[PDB]
Amino acid sequence: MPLVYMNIIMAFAIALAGLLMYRSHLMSSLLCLEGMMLSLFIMSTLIILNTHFTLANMMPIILLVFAACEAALGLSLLVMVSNTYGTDYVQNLNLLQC
Amino acid sequence: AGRIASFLKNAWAKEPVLVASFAIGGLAIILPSLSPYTNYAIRINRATPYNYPVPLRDDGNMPDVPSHPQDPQGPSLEWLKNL
Amino acid sequence: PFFDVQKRLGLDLDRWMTIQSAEQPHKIPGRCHAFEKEWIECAHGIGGIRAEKECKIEFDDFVECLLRQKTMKRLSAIKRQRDKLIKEGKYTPPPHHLGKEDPRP
Amino acid sequence: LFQAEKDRRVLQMLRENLEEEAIIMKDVPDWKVGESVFHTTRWVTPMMGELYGLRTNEEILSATYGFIWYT
Amino acid sequence: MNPIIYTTLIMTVMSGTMLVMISSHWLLIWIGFEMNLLAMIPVLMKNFNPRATEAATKYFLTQATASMMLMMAIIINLLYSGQWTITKMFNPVAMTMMTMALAMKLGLSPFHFWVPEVTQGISLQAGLLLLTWQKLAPLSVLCQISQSINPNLMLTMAMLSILIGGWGGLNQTQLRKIMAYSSIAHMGWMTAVLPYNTTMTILNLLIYITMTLAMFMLLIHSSATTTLSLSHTWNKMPVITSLMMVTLLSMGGLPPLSGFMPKWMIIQEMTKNESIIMPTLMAMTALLNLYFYMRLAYSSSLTMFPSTNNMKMKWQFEHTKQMKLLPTMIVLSTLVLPMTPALSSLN
Amino acid sequence: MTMMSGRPGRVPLQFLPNEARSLPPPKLTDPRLVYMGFLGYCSGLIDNAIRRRPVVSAGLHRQLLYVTSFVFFGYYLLKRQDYMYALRDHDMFAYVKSHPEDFPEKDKKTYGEILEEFHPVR
Amino acid sequence: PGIVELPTLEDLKVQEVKVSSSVLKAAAHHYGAQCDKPNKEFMLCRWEEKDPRRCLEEGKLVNQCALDFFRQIKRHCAEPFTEYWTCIDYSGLQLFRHCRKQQAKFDECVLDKLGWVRPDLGELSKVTKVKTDRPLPENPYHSRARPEPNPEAEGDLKPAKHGSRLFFWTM
Amino acid sequence: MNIMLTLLTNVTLASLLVLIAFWLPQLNAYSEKTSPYECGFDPMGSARLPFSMKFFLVAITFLLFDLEIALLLPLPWASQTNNLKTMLTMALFLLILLAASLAYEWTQKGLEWAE
Amino acid sequence: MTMYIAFILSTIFVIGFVGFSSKPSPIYGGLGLIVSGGVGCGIVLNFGGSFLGLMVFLIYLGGMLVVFGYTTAMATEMYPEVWVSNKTVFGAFVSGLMMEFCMVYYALKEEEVEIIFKFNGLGDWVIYDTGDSGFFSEEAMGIAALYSYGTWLVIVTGWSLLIGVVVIMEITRGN
Ligand SMILES: CCCCCCCCCCCCCCCCCC(=O)OC[C@H](COP(=O)([O-])OCC(O)COP(=O)([O-])OC[C@@H](COC(=O)CCCCCCCCCCCCCCCCC)OC(=O)CCCCCCCCCCCCCCCCC)OC(=O)CCCCCCCCCCCCCCCCC
Ligand SMILES: CCCCCCCCCCCCCCCCC[C@@H](O)O[C@H](CO[C@H](O)CCCCCCCCCCCCCCC)COP(=O)(O)OCC[N+](C)(C)C
Ligand SMILES: CCCCCCCCCCCCCCCCC[C@@H](O)O[C@H](CO[C@H](O)CCCCCCCCCCCCCCC)COP(=O)(O)OCC[N+](C)(C)C
Ligand SMILES: CCCCCCCCCCCCCCCCC[C@@H](O)O[C@H](CO[C@H](O)CCCCCCCCCCCCCCC)COP(=O)(O)OCC[N+](C)(C)C
Numbered sequence A: 001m002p003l004v005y006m007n008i009i010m011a012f013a014i015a016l017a018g019l020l021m022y023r024s025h026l027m028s029s030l031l032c033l034e035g036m037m038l039s040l041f042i043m044s045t046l047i048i049l050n051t052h053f054t055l056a057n058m059m060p061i062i063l064l065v066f067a068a069c070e071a072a073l074g075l076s077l078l079v080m081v082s083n084t085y086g087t088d089y090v091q092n093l094n095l096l097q098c
Numbered sequence B: 001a002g003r004i005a006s007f008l009k010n011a012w013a014k015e016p017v018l019v020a021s022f023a024i025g026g027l028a029i030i031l032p033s034l035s036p037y038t039n040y041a042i043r044i045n046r047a048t049p050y051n052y053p054v055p056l057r058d059d060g061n062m063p064d065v066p067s068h069p070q071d072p073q074g075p076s077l078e079w080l081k082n083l
Numbered sequence C: 001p002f003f004d005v006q007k008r009l010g011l012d013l014d015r016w017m018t019i020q021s022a023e024q025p026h027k028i029p030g031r032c033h034a035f036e037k038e039w040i041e042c043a044h045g046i047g048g049i050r051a052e053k054e055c056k057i058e059f060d061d062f063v064e065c066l067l068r069q070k071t072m073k074r075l076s077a078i079k080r081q082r083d084k085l086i087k088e089g090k091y092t093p094p095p096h097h098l099g100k101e102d103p104r105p
Numbered sequence D: 001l002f003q004a005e006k007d008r009r010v011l012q013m014l015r016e017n018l019e020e021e022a023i024i025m026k027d028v029p030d031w032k033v034g035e036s037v038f039h040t041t042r043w044v045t046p047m048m049g050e051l052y053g054l055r056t057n058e059e060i061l062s063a064t065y066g067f068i069w070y071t
Numbered sequence E: 001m002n003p004i005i006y007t008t009l010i011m012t013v014m015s016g017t018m019l020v021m022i023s024s025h026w027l028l029i030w031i032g033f034e035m036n037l038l039a040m041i042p043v044l045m046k047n048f049n050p051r052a053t054e055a056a057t058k059y060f061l062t063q064a065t066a067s068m069m070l071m072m073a074i075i076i077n078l079l080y081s082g083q084w085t086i087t088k089m090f091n092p093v094a095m096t097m098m099t100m101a102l103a104m105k106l107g108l109s110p111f112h113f114w115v116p117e118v119t120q121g122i123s124l125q126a127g128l129l130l131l132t133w134q135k136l137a138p139l140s141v142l143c144q145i146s147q148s149i150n151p152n153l154m155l156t157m158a159m160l161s162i163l164i165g166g167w168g169g170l171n172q173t174q175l176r177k178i179m180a181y182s183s184i185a186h187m188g189w190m191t192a193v194l195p196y197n198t199t200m201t202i203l204n205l206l207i208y209i210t211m212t213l214a215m216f217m218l219l220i221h222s223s224a225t226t227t228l229s230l231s232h233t234w235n236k237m238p239v240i241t242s243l244m245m246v247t248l249l250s251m252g253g254l255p256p257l258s259g260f261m262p263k264w265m266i267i268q269e270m271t272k273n274e275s276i277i278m279p280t281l282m283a284m285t286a287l288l289n290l291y292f293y294m295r296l297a298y299s300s301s302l303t304m305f306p307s308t309n310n311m312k313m314k315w316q317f318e319h320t321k322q323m324k325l326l327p328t329m330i331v332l333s334t335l336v337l338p339m340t341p342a343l344s345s346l347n
Numbered sequence F: 001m002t003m004m005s006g007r008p009g010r011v012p013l014q015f016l017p018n019e020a021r022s023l024p025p026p027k028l029t030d031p032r033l034v035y036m037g038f039l040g041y042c043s044g045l046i047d048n049a050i051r052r053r054p055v056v057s058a059g060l061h062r063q064l065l066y067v068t069s070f071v072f073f074g075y076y077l078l079k080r081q082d083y084m085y086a087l088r089d090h091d092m093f094a095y096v097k098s099h100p101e102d103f104p105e106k107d108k109k110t111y112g113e114i115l116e117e118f119h120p121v122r
Numbered sequence G: 001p002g003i004v005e006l007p008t009l010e011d012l013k014v015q016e017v018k019v020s021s022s023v024l025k026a027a028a029h030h031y032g033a034q035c036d037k038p039n040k041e042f043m044l045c046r047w048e049e050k051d052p053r054r055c056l057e058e059g060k061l062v063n064q065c066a067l068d069f070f071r072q073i074k075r076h077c078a079e080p081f082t083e084y085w086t087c088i089d090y091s092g093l094q095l096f097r098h099c100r101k102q103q104a105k106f107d108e109c110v111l112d113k114l115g116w117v118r119p120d121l122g123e124l125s126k127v128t129k130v131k132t133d134r135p136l137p138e139n140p141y142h143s144r145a146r147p148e149p150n151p152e153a154e155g156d157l158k159p160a161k162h163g164s165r166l167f168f169w170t171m
Numbered sequence H: 001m002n003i004m005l006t007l008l009t010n011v012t013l014a015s016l017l018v019l020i021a022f023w024l025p026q027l028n029a030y031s032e033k034t035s036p037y038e039c040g041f042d043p044m045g046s047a048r049l050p051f052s053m054k055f056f057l058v059a060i061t062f063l064l065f066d067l068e069i070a071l072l073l074p075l076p077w078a079s080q081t082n083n084l085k086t087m088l089t090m091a092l093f094l095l096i097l098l099a100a101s102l103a104y105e106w107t108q109k110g111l112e113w114a115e
Numbered sequence I: 001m002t003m004y005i006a007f008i009l010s011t012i013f014v015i016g017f018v019g020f021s022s023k024p025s026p027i028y029g030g031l032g033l034i035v036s037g038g039v040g041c042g043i044v045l046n047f048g049g050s051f052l053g054l055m056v057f058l059i060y061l062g063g064m065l066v067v068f069g070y071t072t073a074m075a076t077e078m079y080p081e082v083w084v085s086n087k088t089v090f091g092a093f094v095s096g097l098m099m100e101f102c103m104v105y106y107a108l109k110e111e112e113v114e115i116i117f118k119f120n121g122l123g124d125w126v127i128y129d130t131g132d133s134g135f136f137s138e139e140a141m142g143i144a145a146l147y148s149y150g151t152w153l154v155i156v157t158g159w160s161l162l163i164g165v166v167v168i169m170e171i172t173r174g175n
């Protein structure tokens, strides 16, 4: 594997790590979700272009579409949470325990 | 017969943009299925030689296949120049 | 689990896009069309367990086409020896590997 | 005509690389000169690292990015 | 929410699950998971009540993370072999990533934390759907890729799920958290036998689904979500508590009840593969589930708790809407052991 | 692992292949069918109990439908189960036949020639 | 896994066709009409053998026939042809549309000097047949012997001996 | 390569203009001069306080509608396929569902800003 | 090794990922993701995927505009954080930069195996195709085949987008 593939995979790992390690703002985590989607898009596009798989050229576009549905979903939830607390802090989501 | 006319009059009086858009969309949906030229377009898209026409091995019983491009056998594009 | 309704109805919802040797637009071939075609043909119908052992040659060739790891290793071993041979100075690469070639059509 | 000349150009570059490999790796312990990496014996299209591997960076850059960068 | 909108969201959830179940292309399986989650989020929020918003946000974050790891595993597998078909997963790093993503989706330990919170935060109908229908797609994927699954990782997560579900259920007074921990333990039982026999996995899933449906419908019939609220039901509908006690005993796995069939069928299978310690530990650990089922049975049916005066008014009214499949579900969850050999029809 | 999921010539969603017609159908007095009918009768009784109706005599048409549906489903379930076990037996016998070196026929000694250890109880 | 066979530098020698792209495009239609037989033989070889090392001699005849074609044009009317490709060369896209007068002058020269008829629209893109003495290659993919399949299912279906055989069940 | 040179040239020109703007004139910066502007009186609160979005649902909807232009942008190339009947059915199907999405949001009062 | 353009672009991609993965103020986080989107577009352009790179850049520009608008409303945080405004954010940023440089160095001059496989460098130019033919763009034909081959994909994508409109309208209803 060339250095570009490892750079893309490292980008995905950094974003996943960013998602997993929460700070305070919910939106900061939605941004890491978007970054994971972007890294997947670039990785799959590079693999598809390199092997000249013509039909697969439509799959990153599809991959983009469901990226928006996931973002629009998340932002929707971020609205409701904010409407309850006046803040998007994940500390407030502690009504339910394990 | 009489309800739809009043509805159309009211829609044209209040929201002409919606009437125009619905009419244009309906025409766009319907008309292609009633057109004689829709076949021609397909034929044109079939006449465009994007890749190389690989020759066939003459097995000796291939009458309709040409031996030279200018031979009368094979598909013709005469319908296209007169169009 | 897997309910094979595509096979039952002959519908082909997504099988057109599974492999790169399956009817591309304008007959554009994949980079490894021959290798994947050979590997698929060799392993057809013998089952997964048998195919893994008996079609390992075809699959290894296909993977070599996909990622070209052995090719890069060979090229690196070539250029390292060339670099060593030039650094101490007894190679003198030919003029057509330096830009002084007479190109052909 | 273009295919006929492209075949000869690719083959000539591969042959020149082979002739230079015969010289560079004369005294490498067990290097088999011109050895393939595939089990199969059929023709395999070269990787452009196989064609321009022993050449200058100018022609390598032009062969990789010449068409993409031409505007 | 409008009834038509609710109906179409339910159909979209089911359509996503079926898309996962009928696909041969990895991208379509991923799309099915995405479509399932998209329609699943509003069903969890049907009653607003900010705890539902919290549960929906936690569920969305967990499932989106799992979807991302699933897509990454698909792409790694494609990189190491130009294959999109769901098969034995040619790359082992991709296989580990895929197993972890599916374990997050199912809620196996240690990815189990979200199940009790989301289940407690949503309504009982939403909990029924979440704990029954949502398991079908990931388990159907795992059955397909089971041959390439690493036994050490899958069995580690299975044992952890059984232990953690058993331990967590002991501390619960809320009925929905009890159901969640029971679900975690049964998921562990399902996934322990998966590398050896997928027919046993399917059989356990079906029996667990009928038992969970019966339990959730009995909890909907008597509008109880706490132990003390359920302890009033003997004084209003004794038959419901009697059927609940028998269903709880079956869920415990005691013979001759239906619950026993899967464990009996899994242990035997694991003994044909020279696995002895693992089934013994799993069977001994399931006694924790049995204990906290027996405690609920003590609270609701085997003793009579004090009641309230206003309960007298409730004596004058009947349950209006009836669940037609509840009797069949109860009988199927209890009296089905003599037809065990019919499991051969699942392969 | 799936033992017979991908058996060659298998129709994806058939539930009852044509070759299964070569097997004797289960008798209508099959004790398993009678147990399915008993399950249907119990479902009907519980239906009467939950709805707060006279358990034994509330709805005879409904109880009859419960019994009939359970018996009707059980008949085809039994057919599929019997066919699947017949397939297992067929494949196992065919494989033993086609791999003689893996299942060697062993000439058996008599107990007069075998030497078993004796462990006294005392 | 073996040495790759390569032709010598001498086998790759040929008289080159050293005209530019606009010159080739100006003569493309008549060239495709006149040198069709060797071109189609070489393309059939190329697509059947899947190996450039097995069709060098046909490529040499392709070059030779192109040389003969260009030799006939230079010998009969080089002037009219030169005015046609020079006009074509100026365009950044090398358009036939912009040089119709020059093209007419060239076509009417070659019609009476050599009897050459310009192919009509649709003719050069036809699929044609090729007569060849080259044998059809047997295993061009160099395929290994395919592994033998799992044998078959045969015989009639009999009920399982002693039923299900699961533990205590007698059926 | 030419586009990279063009981008570098444009950014370099803009940055040089900023540098001249900040280093040529005489600066006399003092606290009153650099204070925030709110029409002559000091600001009450912070400008970093939450500022409500009344078109929040249109903004979320714009995300989905923006992804549909990505699906419709390859349409010029799709008109070159032989299966024009299948292609035209899919193109119209995507635009009808796009319009239906807008119709649902419009009728259910989704395009109205919150008060 | 030639011009190191692709390696530089991928490094800037990783640096932008580290920037928004640090979890500072979203306005800043949005900027880092925009930088990453532009640089990933450049990477894809350097491989022949003009349409895909431009589409992803456009999509992420729109999404980040919506995110900026949402940040000013629901993630404002009166003293917003830059990478040097807090020890945690700076520590995460420095950890990301150091880890990327360590991986690059370990994979560059020597050939280490990190998780999956190894790398020697050689520049990404080595793995190209050499294919010489065409009056069309292969990427464009592959994307355009969505309307003739990908009928099922179009159906599921369109249904999902319509359902997404319905779902967002249901979630924010409240009551
Ligand atoms: C191995 C073999 C075995 C396999 C086993 C498989 C698994 C077995 C089962 C697994 C577990 C199942 C769990 C089910 C949970 C369901 C949750 C739930 O509904 O709540 C509980 C519910 C609670 O009721 P409640 O709270 O008292 O009622 C208050 C209301 O909820 C108050 O709400 P309201 O006021 O809004 O009321 C509205 C109400 C009233 O309803 C109405 O008014 C109807 C209105 C009509 C509107 C029409 C809209 C049409 C437009 C939408 C179009 C959408 C298209 C989507 C597709 C897109 C594709 C791209 O509607 C509903 O209540 C729900 C409607 C359900 C609709 C079902 C949609 C099915 C979709 C199918 C998808 C697959 C399609 C193919 C896809 C192919 C791939 C692409 O009661 C129960 O359901 C009890 C449990 C029932 C379980 C059934 C037992 C299992 C099945 C047994 C039958 C046989 C099964 C095997 C079949 C074999 C094959 C033939
Ligand atoms: C608690 C007991 C379980 C209750 C289960 C629900 C009861 C209702 C039955 C559901 C009705 C639908 C089943 C029959 C309709 C048609 C079936 C057909 O279309 O599908 C076939 C499949 O048939 C079904 O599998 C058989 C369903 C029978 C279920 C009953 C077995 C229960 C286990 C024994 C416990 C005792 C139960 C007795 C009931 C009282 C296709 O086979 P195939 O596509 O190739 O397999 C797919 C899965 N593979 C490939 C991974 C293997
Ligand atoms: C149109 C776009 C392209 C334009 C092309 C020309 C580019 C022009 C460059 C842009 C900068 C314009 C600035 C013009 C004024 C000079 C400002 C500064 O550079 O001069 C002083 C630089 O001097 C500093 O005091 C430091 C001097 C020495 C210390 C380090 C310099 C070491 C260099 C060695 C010099 C010794 C002789 C060298 C001979 C080659 C700073 O003084 P300062 O007051 O703050 O700034 C305000 C300037 N005022 C007064 C005119 C308003
Ligand atoms: C059995 C199920 C029926 C009832 C259940 C409905 C659930 C499924 C939803 C809709 C089913 C349609 C999917 C069928 C697969 C489409 C592919 C196949 O049918 O052929 C296509 C036929 O497509 C045609 O356009 C007709 C089908 C399009 C239907 C219009 C969309 C309506 C779907 C509405 C339901 C989906 C969810 C709700 C959205 C509103 C194109 O074939 P063609 O191009 O010749 O050749 C391709 C091969 N080439 C490229 C090598 C040459």
Ligand SMILES: CCCCCCCC/C=C\CCCCCCCC(=O)O[C@H](COC(=O)CCCCCCC/C=C/CCCCCCCC)COP(=O)(O)OCCN
Binding pocket: B008, B011, B015, B018, B019, B020, B021, B022, B023, B024, B025, B026, B027, B029, H096, H099, H100, H102, H103, H106, H107
């Ligand atoms: C057959 C093809 C169909 C698809 C093609 C059309 C493409 C896209 C066109 C539609 C896009 C989405 C349309 C969204 C619908 C809006 C619904 C709506 O909300 O309407 C009301 C208004 O009510 C209406 O819907 C307007 C009239 C009803 C619809 C318009 C006419 C319907 C069809 C008319 C044309 C039919 C064909 C022409 C016949 C010619 C006569 C022979 C909105 O007004 P308010 O915002 O509430 O105003 C508040 C301020 N005063």
